[PDB]
Amino acid sequence: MEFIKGFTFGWDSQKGYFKTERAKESLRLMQERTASEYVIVALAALQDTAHSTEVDFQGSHMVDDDELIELIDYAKSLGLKVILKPTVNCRNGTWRAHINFFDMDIPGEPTWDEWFESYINYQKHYAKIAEKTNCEMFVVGCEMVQAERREDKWRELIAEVRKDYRGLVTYNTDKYQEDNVKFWDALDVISSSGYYPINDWDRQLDRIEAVVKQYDKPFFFVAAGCPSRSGSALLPNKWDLEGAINLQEQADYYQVMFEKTASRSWVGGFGLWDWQTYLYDEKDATKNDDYGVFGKPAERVIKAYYQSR
Ligand SMILES: OC[C@H]1O[C@@H](O[C@H]2[C@H](O)[C@H](O)[C@H](O)O[C@@H]2CO)[C@@H](O)[C@@H](O)[C@@H]1O
Numbered sequence: 001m002e003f004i005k006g007f008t009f010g011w012d013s014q015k016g017y018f019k020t021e022r023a024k025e026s027l028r029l030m031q032e033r034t035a036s037e038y039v040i041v042a043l044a045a046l047q048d049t050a051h052s053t054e055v056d057f058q059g060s061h062m063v064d065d066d067e068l069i070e071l072i073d074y075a076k077s078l079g080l081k082v083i084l085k086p087t088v089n090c091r092n093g094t095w096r097a098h099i100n101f102f103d104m105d106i107p108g109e110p111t112w113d114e115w116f117e118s119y120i121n122y123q124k125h126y127a128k129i130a131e132k133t134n135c136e137m138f139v140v141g142c143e144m145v146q147a148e149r150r151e152d153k154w155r156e157l158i159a160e161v162r163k164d165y166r167g168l169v170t171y172n173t174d175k176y177q178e179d180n181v182k183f184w185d186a187l188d189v190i191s192s193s194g195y196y197p198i199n200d201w202d203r204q205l206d207r208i209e210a211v212v213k214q215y216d217k218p219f220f221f222v223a224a225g226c227p228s229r230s231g232s233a234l235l236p237n238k239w240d241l242e243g244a245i246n247l248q249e250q251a252d253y254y255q256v257m258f259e260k261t262a263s264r265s266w267v268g269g270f271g272l273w274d275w276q277t278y279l280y281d282e283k284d285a286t287k288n289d290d291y292g293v294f295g296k297p298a299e300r301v302i303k304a305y306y307q308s309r
């Protein structure tokens with residue numbers, strides 16, 4: 001597999017966003033400014049809490065199917081390859097990594113089987129869309145740290161996705177969990193959220209390399225990035241990290257990440273986090289402390305590296 005020059009798009013989307021010219025212009029700008037060749041379309045169903053079993057993808061927080069297909073087909077007309085990544089958020093704000101249920105089934109308690117039935121229904125729905133739009137890859141889950149232990153259920157979900165979708169299937173594990181996932185053999189591509197501290201790449205790449213060398217499968221950091229915030233370079237996953245604005249630190253983080261991984265032949269690409277559907281004005285880039293790179297020094301670092309690969 002070719003090196004994946006990717007960027008995550010659409011995380012901010014709601015119903016109706018993708019039908020707009022504003023969405024299509026942001027995607028073209030993403031391509032023009034970063035030289036990305038893949039777009040990761042990240043979508044979020046909702047559940048009420050980390051311990052609820054109903055995964056809701058029908059409310060207006062979700063783009064509808066028609067406009068999702070339209071955006072996908074538009075991205076292909078730009079020459080982009082498409083990775084579809086449907087995940088889930090909690091309405092009360094809990095990180096999805098905490099989604100958890102009792103190990104055993106307790107009468108009256110919510111159970112893994114109930115949650116997985118709802119989650120599978122959601123994933124099969126989007127697996128069918130990925131199939132009819134010929135998405136190059138499908139991501140069955142994202143950073144589901146506590147749920148990763150239910151290996152039987154994840155294998156069942158992947159089998160169900162294979163009935164709908166012929167392309168590459170991956171699972172997006174969280175930072176530091178690459179060596180804990182027990183079902184990589186059921187997937188075509190190994191992937192993780194590579195939010196590693198700016199000063200700990202050597203150790204982490206050594207750890208991940210040993211996992212990857214056990215399989216005949218490409219690996220890539222399907223999510224990776226850093227907010228323009230002081231303190232973020234050490235904790236780049238922490239989207240709610242309290243710190244003052246710092247665009248220099250964000251660009252530093254990207255320069256180190258690329259320099260460290262460029263020499264590791266098995267690091268197969270990135271899905272950088274993230275490019276908003278409805279972008280801030282470029283004249284406000286210098287006051288923005290979010291993950292975005294539009295108008296920021298990190299934008300130049302990314303374009304230069306992507307064009308060199
Ligand atoms: O895509 C156009 C149709 O959308 C439908 O809503 C869906 C939506 O596609 C998506 O599947 C979402 O997650 O669930 C929604 C409600 O079922 C309907 O709005 C339908 O009328 C549209 O033709």
Ligand SMILES: OC[C@H]1O[C@@H](O[C@H]2[C@H](O)[C@H](O)[C@H](O)O[C@@H]2CO)[C@@H](O)[C@@H](O)[C@@H]1O
Binds near residue numbers: 011143223239
């Ligand atoms: O879930 C809503 C928040 O997402 C955040 O991005 C996370 C994303 O959930 C996922 O974990 C990805 O792998 O990393 C991103 C950065 O940590 C932010 O977009 C935040 O603004 C949202 O509230």
